[PDB]
Design a protein around this nucleic acid. Structure first.
Lengths: 93, 79, 108, 97, 79, 97, 93, 106
DNA sequence: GAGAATCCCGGTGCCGAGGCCGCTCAATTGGTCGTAGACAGCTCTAGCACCGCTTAAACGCACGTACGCGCTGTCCCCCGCGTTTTAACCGCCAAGGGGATTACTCCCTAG
DNA sequence: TAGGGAGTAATCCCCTTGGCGGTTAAAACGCGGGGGACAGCGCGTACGTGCGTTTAAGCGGTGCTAGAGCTGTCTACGACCAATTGAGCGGCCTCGGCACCGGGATTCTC
């Protein structure tokens, strides 16, 4: 048993490019890329939460970590996508 | 005129710290343009740390952590 | 009583619960809030979607139907925020963008 | 009528600043500069005194670390005087673009 | 003939990947020297990850973690 | 017959090598080199071919980046032919000593 | 109510030099040095523990850590003195 | 009885064990591992204090200044590349004068 | 040979660097239990070794020509220095705005 | 199902932002002069080009066996909990190392 993200990112590619094939090595690069991005974002958030003497990770410290890591227009588009996703998910009423 | 705060004999003082016999006259404004991006690059990561701390003052504690995040960890003011 | 996963509650195709699992036993914090995996999942959604967009346009730009790592390399190195984010990583089997200095040309 | 050769007293004061290690940057103009560069994002900013000293030490260390590198680029360029092209090649070889 | 196992046009191939025009003859042993000082720092870290893991063979994992260390990271073999 | 100007078919070879993505070092001398360089730290050490490919890709990227750095330092020095002091300058200003 | 390390480095300094004085900026400097070394060693030990599927940190992983980051003669000095302290503890259990 | 005195060290093994366990590095932690970290921190502290002491006595002072600390870190090459990314405060730079920049002859 | 410009020897507050007591949390000791690390034992992937055909890549000698390099004459723009002048800095007084901290509470996140 | 971690908030006190003013090292500015950077031209040789002659990379095939990797089982190291004592932080107190100042020897430079 081993874990990969392959079906999800495959679906992401079929949403915008239906007639496009895939090399397995390309999944190896892109899986390493998404794991590396998750890696830096998560330890930046943990480092920031350890700074503020807090024991809890919420949306705001990863928001600040996204603002710290990503370039500015990617930062603003990423926080736009994240805020609309978390407000859609938070409307469970 | 406030951007003219940094003075040319101070740039000469920084130049003779490097041990250079001859300085041409364009080096001063070149170093001005170099330094202006440079300090703003740590003001970028200082005031966001300050804002996430729910603070409206900066200190010696977040600026050293900004330099430690980018990669010139500095000793003397804690951290 | 049966309800589906949080990923389509947030309208995302990446797994929210798997990200929550990795954030839980990745020993980053002793307590993890509810809204953190949704935000992180959305960020990974947008990053993967943009990288796949640039790769798909690169593969269309070479008249092929498959994603070669050359397409990934040229899509990352051609664009400049992806240049700044991914400056220190070497793509396996990527190659080098063509550039000649102007003084090295046969100027005559 | 005692006129020095140009560069000898430059090297002598280079030596004096080589034993010296004090701050070579005026405090209040740099405080004005950091306030006018920090005002643009969230106004009414209070500043601690030690943060300005940390900023002074970091800008001075970055300046001397860039200046040794561009001295090496200049002495490799078969010249004694520096130029903007040495500064660009120093920034290219150190990699901060 | 191990350290000169790489051949004379191999530095030429790595040269013309780099966009160079004219190449000297004294640089080949010097590029071999920076090969030696690069591969010592790589495989000493690789063999520390190797015999820490109670194995006497290097896998695809410890080499890319060794490469992950100094900041010259490489994708493709992360799984 | 018809010849070519020295430095014109070299442009064609440059663009051929900067199109072609293939591997520029033979696998058996490199694997002999890494085996005899890993023998010094620890004996009876086996290897993996994926590790061989990762190592060869790392060093190929390293000579490539170092080599346009050397080329840029050479055209910085108002020359076309590169020399050893360009390599030493590139290593010194890049940070590895 | 912060915690410092000043008494221990003062005791060590008086063990090696019975005449030297010290300034407080130097104490802040080398307290930051001690914390930086401790933090780098600790994240490397946690990384090597999580990398070998290992849920406990024992002296073997910090031994590998002080082998991999510290310079070599300092590395084997630290290995020798730390192993000496390890047998001094296990003898005096 | 103090564990530092049991291990023959002068550094607070309990304090670094506390910092290690409440630092979120692993679910479980060892017993001799904080002793080992304590011993190596004592060694690096003693060695840098010895180097700073020598750099104090060669310039006639009985007081440690950060300029003496810079003189103590930069001369030792292994320590220098250990701290090649570290900026010190009020330390200065070493005096190096280039031979081409040095004038005259002989 | 002279002359700025250093290095070197002696007097002076000082104010900032060593003791010391008070004491409050934080390191130490003991007991319990439930799981994780270590060892034994097991099945097969995969790494090493060698034989042999093919041949494209590599070595070596020959030469020819641009390009690295030595020298030279020249604007000329940086460098030492006198003269204003202008803002930096030190001593200080007052405010009030912002950080620390106490203290209960509830909800939401661990299990 | 539980419990304890942010969250709110009020209060105290501390530092830091303005505002005084003198005075003073120090920057701005203009001016004489001197090597340093600039292009230009010639001398030679070193790298590019080419063909003859290896050679030992590459494929690919096979044979063998270490060693990676999974499972089972155990027990002892370590988290957890309750009581305890001591030691390291801190306010306070006291005094001498070094910077500062004054004046004479001494060394490169012209």
């Amino acid at each position: 048993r081993k874990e990969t993200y392959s079906s999800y990112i495959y679906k992401v590619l079929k949403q915008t490019h239906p007639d496009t094939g895939i090399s397995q090595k390309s999944m190896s690069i892109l899986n390493s890329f998404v794991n590396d991005i998750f890696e830096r974002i998560a330890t930046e958030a943990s480092k920031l939460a350890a700074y503020n003497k807090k024991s809890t990770i919420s949306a705001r410290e990863i928001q600040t970590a996204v603002r710290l890591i990503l370039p500015g227009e990617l930062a603003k588009h990423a926080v736009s996508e994240g805020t609309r996703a978390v407000t859609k998910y938070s409307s469970s009423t | 005129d406030n951007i003219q705060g940094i003075t040319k004999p101070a740039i000469r003082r920084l130049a003779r710290r490097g041990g250079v016999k001859r300085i041409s006259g364009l080096i001063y404004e070149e170093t001005r343009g170099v330094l202006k991006v440079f300090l703003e690059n740590v003001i970028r990561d200082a005031v966001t740390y300050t804002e996430h701390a729910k603070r409206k003052t900066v200190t010696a504690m977040d600026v050293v952590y900004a330099l430690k995040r980018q990669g010139r960890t500095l000793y003397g003011f804690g951290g | 009583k049966a309800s589906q996963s949080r990923s389509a509650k947030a309208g995302l195709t990446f797994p929210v619960g798997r990200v929550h699992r990795l954030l839980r036993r990745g020993n980053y914090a002793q307590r993890i809030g509810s809204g953190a995996p949704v935000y992180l999942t959305a960020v990974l959604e947008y990053l993967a979607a943009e990288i796949l967009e640039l790769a798909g346009n690169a593969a269309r730009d070479n008249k092929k139907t498959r994603i070669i790592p050359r397409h990934l390399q040229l899509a990352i190195r051609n664009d400049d925020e992806l240049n700044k984010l991914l400056g220190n990583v070497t793509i396996a089997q990527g190659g080098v963008l063509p550039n000649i200095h102007q003084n090295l040309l046969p100027k005559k | 009528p005692h006129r020095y050769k140009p560069g000898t007293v430059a090297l002598r004061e280079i030596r004096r600043f080589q034993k010296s290690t004090e701050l070579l940057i005026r405090k209040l103009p740099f405080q004005r500069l950091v306030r006018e560069i920090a005002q643009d994002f969230k106004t009414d900013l209070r500043f601690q005194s030690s943060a300005i000293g940390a900023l002074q030490e970091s800008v001075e260390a970055y300046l001397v670390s860039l200046f040794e590198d561009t001295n090496l680029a200049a002495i490799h360029a078969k010249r004694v005087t520096i130029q903007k092209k040495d500064i660009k090649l120093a920034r290219r070889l150190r990699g901060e673009r």
